[PDB]
Design a protein around this nucleic acid. Structure first.
Ligand SMILES: Nc1ncnc2c1ncn2[C@@H]1O[C@H](CSCC[C@H](N)C(=O)O)[C@@H](O)[C@H]1O
Ligand SMILES: *OC[C@H]1O[C@@H](n2ccc(N)nc2=O)C[C@@H]1O
Length: 327
DNA sequence: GATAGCGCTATC
DNA sequence: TGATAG
DNA sequence: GCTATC
């Protein structure tokens, strides 16, 4: 992740809903905020959270009495996105994992925090003819908050990963916050090969499919895009090899394919998926972060996590706005 | 749970 | 008649 | 992401 000398969010307290690995925790904390509550019902995500924050999140948010949630300035929430993803059934709100946002709303209505910082997949912005995004928007205003949503790509904030996401920032009206802005993009100068480990430590990840099919020659220069080199199987998800000379694809939490969740990369002429540590780096996570012992769960967690760096930039702007108080 | 072929969508 | 990524 | 396999 990036370093932020002056911490705008100093003095402000936040909530880590749908905690997961604690992406919003790492993002916010760096800006000076204090986390006063986290929630996560998955046994394994719970584990890693405790391995890194010495704490265990509260289970099922759908059963927590909002009156229980601690008072706070910023409510962070990257609720479930398997229902609006371009890779699923897209039943959205008509899905068991499709609601959850109404729990976010249920909590704001009772806690009225200065800011609501949310996150979800890019498709969420167009899902159901933009009507489902409109519902989040209308819901928020009803509660008396402005609404700033926007889809960003990590390949624009120094992270070599084609990971897109919708980011929705909400300010309370009584605060008349009018100068909020999303972080400006900038040239990427880090690529997949720059985050890899010594092939010595990942020889167990190597795979050799006699049905491997190269479809393009290795590139010379690096690029802020994903360059495919080959295909295995029918080339479906998890069956596509990319160059470490370009950037990394989206890391998925439930993706299948032989190169399940991370995708395939041609490393030293060796075909293989990424190591958990590498996924961490790809998500802008510090090496000091301890990954879950179960790798399947680890890929799964980084799979549906958030990129630290982008959150940091956004958190910074949230403070710069909250901190602009002229007479 | 962990593994993997898949099979349909969105954007172009 | 195509092509790639989720 | 879904889902059948073990
Ligand atoms: N009812 C519920 N209560 C608590 N957590 C829930 C939940 N339903 C889904 N979740 C959790 O929602 C999370 C969405 S993933 C969000 C990622 C997270 N902000 C990060 O930085 O990693 C998952 O970890 C899932 O287990
Ligand atoms: O692109 C959808 C696919 O990737 C995972 N994911 C991607 C991007 C964001 N913002 N969140 C995610 O969880 C989920 C899905 O499996």
């Amino acid at each position: 992740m990036i370093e932020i000398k002056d911490k705008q969010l100093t003095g402000l307290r936040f909530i880590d809903l749908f905690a997961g690995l604690g992406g919003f925790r790492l993002a916010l904390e760096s800006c000076g905020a204090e986390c006063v509550y986290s929630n996560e019902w998955d046994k394994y995500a719970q584990e890693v959270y405790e391995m890194n924050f010495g704490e265990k999140p509260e289970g099922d948010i759908t059963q927590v009495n909002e009156k229980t949630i601690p008072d706070h300035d910023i409510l962070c929430a990257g609720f479930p996105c398997q229902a609006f993803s371009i890779s699923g059934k897209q039943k959205g709100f008509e899905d068991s994992r499709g609601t959850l946002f109404f729990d976010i709303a249920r909590i704001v209505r009772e806690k009225k925090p200065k800011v609501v910082f949310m996150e979800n997949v890019k498709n969420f912005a167009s899902h159901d003819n933009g009507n489902t995004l409109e519902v989040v928007k209308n819901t928020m205003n009803e509660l008396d908050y402005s609404f700033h949503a926007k889809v960003l790509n990590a390949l624009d904030y120094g992270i070599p990963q084609k990971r897109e996401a919708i980011y929705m920032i909400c300010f309370r009206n009584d605060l008349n916050i009018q100068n909020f802005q999303f972080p400006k993009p900038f040239e990427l100068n880090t690529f997949v090969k720059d985050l890899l480990l010594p092939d010595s430590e990942v020889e167990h990840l190597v795979i050799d499919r006699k049905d491997l099919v190269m479809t393009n020659q290795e590139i010379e220069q690096t690029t802020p895009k994903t360059v495919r080199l080959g295909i295995v199987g029918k080339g479906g998800q998890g069956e596509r090899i990319y160059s470490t000379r370009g950037i990394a694809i989206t890391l998925s939490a439930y993706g299948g394919g032989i190169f399940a969740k991370t995708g395939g990369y041609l490393v030293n002429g060796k075909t293989r998926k990424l190591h958990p540590r590498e996924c961490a780096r790809v998500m802008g996570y510090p090496d000091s972060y301890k990954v879950h012992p179960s790798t399947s769960q680890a890929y799964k967690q980084f799979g549906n996590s958030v990129v630290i760096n982008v959150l940091q930039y956004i958190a910074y702007n949230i403070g710069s706005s909250l901190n602009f108080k002229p007479y």
